[PDB]
């Protein structure tokens, strides 16, 4: 029987897979973050951080449990994507793999909610504060790619 | 290359700062261990070791990969150079300094299978040109082509020959560590099925 | 470097898994590994899956052939050994202003 | 060494075999060959039942 109870998309248990011809590694800073150092070789070169729902990586004594149903979740976090405009998420069903495009969320003062960017093509969706709650330092402006 | 001081790139070392600093909070010492091989791909050609014929000696892996010969001086301030650097993460926390010289031989060609199999990779330019320019004498004739097959008895001081260099290559390398890093711990690996019953005459001679 | 900050779950349907965590008794052995292996995970989940079961004192890690180095890739012409490696874009844009 | 991971038990008993004559040679230091393997398979150590 389960004797802990784990958070849901906890920084120490991500994982990293990768092509050959490159070479990257993940290492967690703080409660909430992670970092994926990484050494870019050639065009094909393609990285994806993961969260897996089955245990496979653990002694059978250190496992955790596997529950397929994401309902009612939201996950909110920032980002360096060389592109911001066109950026993904690879989300696999037992059926088919399917491909989500993340769009740039930015607050507005006036009326005090996370409303997209990207007005022509984009989700119409807006959501409250508190969605994003910021506790750990920041990413370096030099390091962020300006989007609109 | 051989001008960069510092071999290792950037995630590895990271990786390894925050390992070496995870095993210092509970009390645990670490020894670290660079071997010869480095990926075929990516290796340069003049360090690969050759077989009788053109061919480099690869390996039983999807990706092949190619052995350092001993003669050469630049691979092995590679291979020190990468130890050092590892060595100095470590120093700089409260950390003993422990390391181990792995995987040092002459490949065969036992593990591969076709293409070359069998077929010993002694016969490089550079290591026979050094043959010639000191002791003298040639390389001997109708070379051996083949693991398991009867060795003439010319070709044997040859063999003796590359033995000792063999011998001398960890020992540099030891002296390089050592003298870079005073109070450092060097150390080998055996494995004893073939140091007490060699897979023949050739290899016993050979790679011990 | 990729920064992947301040992760933040919210909403209302099962936020917290279940696992199992039992540490065992200490014995004489001491745990060893390879790099090229434990590329993938986070170096604290070995280490206190490791510390957890019992290894002690000793540890002796084999640095993988295929990760530790830098490298290069490029081409390189068959009738002169020429190598490129670097990229550009060539393009002619021409601006169109006024009325 | 445990490759082919469906040949886990004989090469695991082989194993406590070989460990039980090394502590009875006095060697101080002793080591499980890898991680992966380790954990892959499961390996816990545990006094043997007595019936």
Not at chain 1, 52 to 74: A, C, K, Q, W
Not at chain 2, 19 to 40: G, P, Q, T
Not at chain 4, 12 to 34: Q, R
């Amino acid at each position: 029987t389960y004797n802990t109870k784990l958070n849901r998309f906890d920084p120490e248990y991500w994982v990293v897979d990768y092509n050959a011809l490159m070479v990257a590694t993940i290492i967690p800073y703080g409660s909430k973050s992670f970092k994926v150092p990484c050494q870019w070789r050639t065009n094909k070169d393609f990285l994806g951080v993961r969260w897996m729902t089955e245990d496979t990586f653990d002694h059978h004594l250190y496992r955790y449990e596997t529950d397929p149903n994401y309902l009612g979740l939201i996950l909110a976090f920032r980002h360096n994507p060389d592109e911001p405009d066109k950026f993904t998420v690879t989300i696999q069903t037992p059926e088919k793999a399917y491909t989500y495009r993340l769009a740039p969320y930015g607050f507005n003062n006036k009326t005090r909610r996370w409303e997209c960017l990207d007005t022509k093509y984009g989700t119409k969706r807006t959501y409250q504060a508190d969605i994003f709650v910021a506790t750990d330092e920041d990413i370096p402006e030099s390091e962020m790619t300006e989007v609109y | 290359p051989v001008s960069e001081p510092e071999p290792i790139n950037m995630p590895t070392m990271e990786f390894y700062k925050r390992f070496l600093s995870l095993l210092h909070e509970r009390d645990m010492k670490f020894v670290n261990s660079v071997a010869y091989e480095i990926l075929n791909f990516f290796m340069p050609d003049e360090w690969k070791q050759l077989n009788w014929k053109g061919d480099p000696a690869l390996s039983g892996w999807y990706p092949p990969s190619s052995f350092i010969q001993p003669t050469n001086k630049d691979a092995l301030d590679f291979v020190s150079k990468a130890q050092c650097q590892i060595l100095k993460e470590c120093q700089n926390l409260g950390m003993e300094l422990y390391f181990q010289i792995g995987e040092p031989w002459w490949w065969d060609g036992s593990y591969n299978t076709g293409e070359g199999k069998n077929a010993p990779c002694i016969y490089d330019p550079k290591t026979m040109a050094l043959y010639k320019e000191e002791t003298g004498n040639d390389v001997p004739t109708p070379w051996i082509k083949d693991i398991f097959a009867p060795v003439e008895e010319h070709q044997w001081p040859y063999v003796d020959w590359l033995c000792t260099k063999l011998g001398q290559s960890t020992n540099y390398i030891r002296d390089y560590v050592k003298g870079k890093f005073p109070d450092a711990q060097a150390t080998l690996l055996f494995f004893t099925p073939q140091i007490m019953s060699p897979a023949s005459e050739l290899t016993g001679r050979l790679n011990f | 470097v990729k920064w992947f900050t301040n992760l933040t779950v919210s909403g209302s349907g099962r936020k917290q898994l279940g696992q199992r965590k039992y540490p065992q008794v200490v014995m004489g052995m001491g745990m060893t590994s390879g790099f090229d292996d434990g590329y993938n995970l986070t170096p604290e989940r070995q280490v206190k899956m490791a510390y957890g079961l019992g290894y002690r004192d000793w540890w002796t890690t084999y640095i993988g052939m295929s990760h530790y180095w830098k490298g290069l890739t490029a081409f390189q012409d068959k009738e002169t050994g020429e190598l490129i490696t670097e990229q550009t874009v060539l393009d002619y844009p021409i601006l169109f202003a006024g009325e | 060494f445990v490759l082919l991971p469906e040949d886990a038990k004989k090469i695991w008993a082989d194993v406590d075999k070989a460990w039980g004559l090394a502590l009875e040679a006095g060697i101080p230091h002793i080591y499980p060959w890898s991680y992966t393997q380790v954990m892959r398979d499961g390996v816990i150590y545990a006094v043997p039942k007595v019936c």
